[PDB]
Amino acid sequence: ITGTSTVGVGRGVLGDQKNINTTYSTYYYLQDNTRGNGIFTYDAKYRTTLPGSLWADADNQFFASYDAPAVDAHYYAGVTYDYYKNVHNRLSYDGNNAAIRSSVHYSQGYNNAFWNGSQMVYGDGDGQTFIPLSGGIDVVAHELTHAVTDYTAGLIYQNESGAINEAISDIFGTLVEFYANKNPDWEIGEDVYTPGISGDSLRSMSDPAKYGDPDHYSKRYTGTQDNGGVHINSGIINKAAYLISQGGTHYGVSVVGIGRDKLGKIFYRALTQYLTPTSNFSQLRAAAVQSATDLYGSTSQEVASVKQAFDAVGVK
Ligand SMILES: [Ca+2]
Numbered sequence: 454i455t456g457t458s459t460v461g462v463g464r465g466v467l468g469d470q471k472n473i474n475t476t477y478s479t480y481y482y483l484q485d486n487t488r489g490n491g492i493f494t495y496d497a498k499y500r501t502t503l504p505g506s507l508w509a510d511a512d513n514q515f516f517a518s519y520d521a522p523a524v525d526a527h528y529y530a531g532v533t534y535d536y537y538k539n540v541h542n543r544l545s546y547d548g549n550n551a552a553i554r555s556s557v558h559y560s561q562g563y564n565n566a567f568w569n570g571s572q573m574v575y576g577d578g579d580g581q582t583f584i585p586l587s588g589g590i591d592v593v594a595h596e597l598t599h600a601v602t603d604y605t606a607g608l609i610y611q612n613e614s615g616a617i618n619e620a621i622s623d624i625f626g627t628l629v630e631f632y633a634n635k636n637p638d639w640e641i642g643e644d645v646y647t648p649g650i651s652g653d654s655l656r657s658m659s660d661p662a663k664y665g666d667p668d669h670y671s672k673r674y675t676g677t678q679d680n681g682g683v684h685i686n687s688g689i690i691n692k693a694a695y696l697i698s699q700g701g702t703h704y705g706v707s708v709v710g711i712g713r714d715k716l717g718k719i720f721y722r723a724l725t726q727y728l729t730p731t732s733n734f735s736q737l738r739a740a741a742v743q744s745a746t747d748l749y750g751s752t753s754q755e756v757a758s759v760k761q762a763f764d765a766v767g768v769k
Pocket residue numbers: 510511512513514515516
């Protein structure tokens with residue numbers, strides 16, 4: 454809507470206070486006009502109809518429990534937009550400042566969040582397995598990254614191409630978590646997963662096997678469940694990414710870490726310049742090697758580490 458840009462204050466899912474960009478026009482709306490064509494957050498009111506109603510508040514103060522998921526979805530979408538703009542010089546997910554829209558309070562006790570090709574959607578969780586999913590910055594960045602992939606490589610959500618699609622979202626979800634410096638780690642969804650159990654997460658990039666996911670190509674899932682194991686086989690790529698950044702010895706193969714910044718540059722270039730809708734793991738390796746070559750030279754340590762990382766997880 455048309456109005457005056459202002460700043461409100463509220464508390465997120467984890468109880469932390471933060472300032473959020475809003476728009477004033479009779480009511481204060483969760484509409485951030487400071488980033489691209491705007492960031493809009495909607496209330497799905499426990500229904501499944503999308504997007505719902507643009508979030509309206511009477512006093513620009515968001516401290517009600519019902520407000521929490523909206524505050525975080527709105528705020529973290531902004532942080533993610535900043536990451537892509539400041540680090541990769543990319544304006545929003547389409548590269549042309551497309552408006553970012555998110556709906557919270559989707560359905561009842563919904564233990565999931567997703568990008569539906571047009572917007573982000575967040576469930577509130579059942580309170581046991583998950584608390585409102587927008588409370589996790591790696592979750593929000595994971596979803597917005599799916600939008601980036603859709604407008605670039607367009608990786609099909611099935612089999613190996615889908616596993617890469619998933620890994621890319623976990624990789625950048627984690628890089629954004631580090632960017633915001635919010636208790637960063639290489640785990641996925643730890644802030645909103647199982648509130649009654651500390652120390653766990655949905656997936657782990659440092660050790661995918663901790664939760665039963667494969668950490669080597671020889672252990673890849675070949676069934677039909679989960680669209681061919683897109684959330685399972687992503688562990689093979691996540692481990693490779695972790696090794697490239699942090700280094701280590703995996704299955705007898707030693708990798709010299711080159712850091713998170715370079716990991717981000719290498720994968721962003723691979724995603725935007727070399728990957729295609731049907732790319733498989735072997736092609737991702739080639740794309741990553743070529744990207745590192747473009748940026749640091751064929752005889753660089755960076756290229757060496759990328760090769761070692763993929764060798765470590767058995768991807769030739
Ligand atoms: Ca209020």
